[PDB]
Design a protein that fits this description.
The protein is an all-alpha fold. It contains eight helices and no strands. It has one domain: Globin-like, CATH 1.10.490.20. It is classed as de novo protein.
Length: 174
């Protein structure tokens, strides 16, 4: 119980320290506020049925990111073909990394189970991170593939609960 929530906290806390320099100080501020709300929610038993799904996705991040990017590159092969923006290994690696970071921020939104803090804190972290990262190739498409790769690992009933969290992020990034 408390140890699986601590796995999620350790995961988010490790994301923040690794991405702080690249995501910029404003995004770091929003992320830490979200983590404190998440721990405030857990302490008071708020929206606790979303952690089990979040944990599955957290244990399967690399699988998810790999499946999403493979699906992204089949749909748009010019991205990784010569002359494409992810042909060079540096920039392909930056793509994969940035996709993994957008994924973990979405999973933070999932854990809260509440659209209010998702729009007032989580989305501000995603938008500020996007502003700090700058050019993120196929940003919107990659989130859709992250969503499909994620729902891939879930039963129909868990998918029907998780999809509205991806769709709220996708919509809000225009």
């Amino acid at each position: 119980g408390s140890e699986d929530f601590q796995y999620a906290i350790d995961m988010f806390k490790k994301f923040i320290e690794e991405a702080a320099a690249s995501m910029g100080p404003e995004a770091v501020k929003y992320a830490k506020e979200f983590l404190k709300l998440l721990k405030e929610y857990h302490k008071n038993g708020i929206n606790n049925r979303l952690l089990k799904i979040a944990l599955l996705l957290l244990r399967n991040q690399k699988k998810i990111v790999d499946k999403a990017s493979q699906d992204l590159w089949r749909r748009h092969p010019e991205l990784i073909a010569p002359g494409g923006i992810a042909f060079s290994q540096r920039d392909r690696a930056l793509c994969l990394r940035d996709y993994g970071w957008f994924l973990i921020l979405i999973v933070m939104c999932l854990v809260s189970g509440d659209k209010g803090p998702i729009e007032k804190i989580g989305l501000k972290c995603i938008r500020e991170m996007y502003n700090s990262l700058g050019v993120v190739p196929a940003m919107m498409e990659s989130i859709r593939c992250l969503k499909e790769a994620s729902l891939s690992l879930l039963d129909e009933e868990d998918a029907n609960e998780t999809a509205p969290y991806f769709d709220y992020i996708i919509k809000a990034m225009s």
